[PDB]
Design an enzyme around this catalytic site. Sequence first.
Site, PDB file in Angstrom:
ATOM      1  N   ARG A 131      30.671  35.855  20.958  1.00  0.00           N
ATOM      2  CA  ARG A 131      31.435  35.006  21.867  1.00  0.00           C
ATOM      3  C   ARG A 131      30.773  34.994  23.237  1.00  0.00           C
ATOM      4  O   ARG A 131      30.464  36.046  23.789  1.00  0.00           O
ATOM      5  CB  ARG A 131      32.899  35.469  21.999  1.00  0.00           C
ATOM      6  CG  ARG A 131      33.785  34.985  20.863  1.00  0.00           C
ATOM      7  CD  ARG A 131      35.260  35.235  21.138  1.00  0.00           C
ATOM      8  NE  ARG A 131      35.587  36.650  21.143  1.00  0.00           N
ATOM      9  CZ  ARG A 131      35.988  37.365  20.086  1.00  0.00           C
ATOM     10  NH1 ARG A 131      36.175  36.797  18.898  1.00  0.00           N
ATOM     11  NH2 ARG A 131      36.237  38.664  20.234  1.00  0.00           N
ATOM     12  N   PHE A 155      33.417  34.054  32.509  1.00  0.00           N
ATOM     13  CA  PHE A 155      34.153  35.213  32.019  1.00  0.00           C
ATOM     14  C   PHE A 155      33.175  36.307  31.585  1.00  0.00           C
ATOM     15  O   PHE A 155      32.946  37.264  32.321  1.00  0.00           O
ATOM     16  CB  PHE A 155      35.125  34.780  30.909  1.00  0.00           C
ATOM     17  CG  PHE A 155      35.904  35.904  30.285  1.00  0.00           C
ATOM     18  CD1 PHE A 155      36.476  36.901  31.051  1.00  0.00           C
ATOM     19  CD2 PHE A 155      36.096  35.937  28.911  1.00  0.00           C
ATOM     20  CE1 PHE A 155      37.196  37.921  30.460  1.00  0.00           C
ATOM     21  CE2 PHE A 155      36.816  36.957  28.320  1.00  0.00           C
ATOM     22  CZ  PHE A 155      37.360  37.949  29.095  1.00  0.00           C
ATOM     23  N   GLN A 207      30.059  38.533  24.983  1.00  0.00           N
ATOM     24  CA  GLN A 207      30.587  39.567  24.106  1.00  0.00           C
ATOM     25  C   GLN A 207      29.648  39.719  22.913  1.00  0.00           C
ATOM     26  O   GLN A 207      29.379  38.759  22.219  1.00  0.00           O
ATOM     27  CB  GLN A 207      32.003  39.202  23.631  1.00  0.00           C
ATOM     28  CG  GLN A 207      32.978  38.924  24.767  1.00  0.00           C
ATOM     29  CD  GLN A 207      34.411  38.651  24.313  1.00  0.00           C
ATOM     30  OE1 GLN A 207      34.668  38.336  23.138  1.00  0.00           O
ATOM     31  NE2 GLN A 207      35.363  38.794  25.244  1.00  0.00           N
ATOM     32  N   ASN A 234      37.277  46.745  22.714  1.00  0.00           N
ATOM     33  CA  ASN A 234      38.069  47.663  21.891  1.00  0.00           C
ATOM     34  C   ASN A 234      39.239  46.947  21.222  1.00  0.00           C
ATOM     35  O   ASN A 234      39.425  45.744  21.419  1.00  0.00           O
ATOM     36  CB  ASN A 234      38.526  48.877  22.736  1.00  0.00           C
ATOM     37  CG  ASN A 234      39.489  48.500  23.853  1.00  0.00           C
ATOM     38  OD1 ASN A 234      40.453  47.789  23.622  1.00  0.00           O
ATOM     39  ND2 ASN A 234      39.243  48.999  25.069  1.00  0.00           N
ATOM     40  N   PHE A 291      30.845  44.106  26.463  1.00  0.00           N
ATOM     41  CA  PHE A 291      30.979  42.954  27.343  1.00  0.00           C
ATOM     42  C   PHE A 291      29.919  43.019  28.445  1.00  0.00           C
ATOM     43  O   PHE A 291      29.678  44.093  29.003  1.00  0.00           O
ATOM     44  CB  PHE A 291      32.331  42.981  28.101  1.00  0.00           C
ATOM     45  CG  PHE A 291      33.578  43.023  27.257  1.00  0.00           C
ATOM     46  CD1 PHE A 291      33.662  42.415  26.005  1.00  0.00           C
ATOM     47  CD2 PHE A 291      34.735  43.584  27.786  1.00  0.00           C
ATOM     48  CE1 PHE A 291      34.854  42.422  25.284  1.00  0.00           C
ATOM     49  CE2 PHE A 291      35.925  43.569  27.079  1.00  0.00           C
ATOM     50  CZ  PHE A 291      35.983  42.992  25.823  1.00  0.00           C
ATOM     51  N   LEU A 305      41.061  43.969  33.260  1.00  0.00           N
ATOM     52  CA  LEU A 305      40.535  44.870  32.232  1.00  0.00           C
ATOM     53  C   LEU A 305      40.430  46.326  32.698  1.00  0.00           C
ATOM     54  O   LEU A 305      40.246  47.225  31.871  1.00  0.00           O
ATOM     55  CB  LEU A 305      39.173  44.385  31.750  1.00  0.00           C
ATOM     56  CG  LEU A 305      39.116  42.935  31.243  1.00  0.00           C
ATOM     57  CD1 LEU A 305      37.692  42.592  30.850  1.00  0.00           C
ATOM     58  CD2 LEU A 305      40.061  42.735  30.063  1.00  0.00           C
ATOM     59  N   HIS A 353      39.446  48.953  29.454  1.00  0.00           N
ATOM     60  CA  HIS A 353      38.089  48.955  28.934  1.00  0.00           C
ATOM     61  C   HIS A 353      37.213  49.857  29.754  1.00  0.00           C
ATOM     62  O   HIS A 353      37.223  49.783  30.986  1.00  0.00           O
ATOM     63  CB  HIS A 353      37.546  47.541  28.943  1.00  0.00           C
ATOM     64  CG  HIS A 353      38.303  46.641  28.032  1.00  0.00           C
ATOM     65  ND1 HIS A 353      37.924  46.416  26.727  1.00  0.00           N
ATOM     66  CD2 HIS A 353      39.454  45.958  28.218  1.00  0.00           C
ATOM     67  CE1 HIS A 353      38.807  45.617  26.153  1.00  0.00           C
ATOM     68  NE2 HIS A 353      39.747  45.327  27.037  1.00  0.00           N
TER      69      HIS A 353
END
Length: 170
Positions: free
Chosen positions: A61, A66, A69, A108, A119, A128, A132
Amino acid sequence: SRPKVFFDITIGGSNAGRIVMELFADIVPKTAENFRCLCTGERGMGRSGKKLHYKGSKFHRVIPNFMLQGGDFTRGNGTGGESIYGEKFPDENFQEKHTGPGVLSMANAGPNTNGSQFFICTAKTEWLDGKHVVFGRVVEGMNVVKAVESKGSQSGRTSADIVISDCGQL
Ligand SMILES: [Cl-]
């Protein structure tokens, strides 16, 4: 004495450049060691019976404004991956925060479920924090990250395959 590791990235099979990352071994040593080993491949085989190695894996992704991933080297779709410690490992600490572009953080599926997925932030993602584990940062190749980001979409689907064609430690 923070380790440095790298990804060479291909977009549609062609080199896009190198991303160099520094790992916070001083703050999250177990998490940094997992990521370092997944870059080098040095631990051999995982629970999956596949190599514990990011080499050849795809970003599942990529979401503009943003993050990128990646790290699902068993399935390449965001449902696989595993750590050097086994399928999952604990959240070491949440000392480092999601402060902006270039932050490296673990994906996760809730508390203490770190694996291999990670990420690379392309924005400040403060929501986050505390969920994370942040374990490093990009120190070279944010322009490469930007080039990858441009192949993404809101759903995360990429318009060309984004592959870690090589990786390792520097
Ligand atoms: Cl903490």
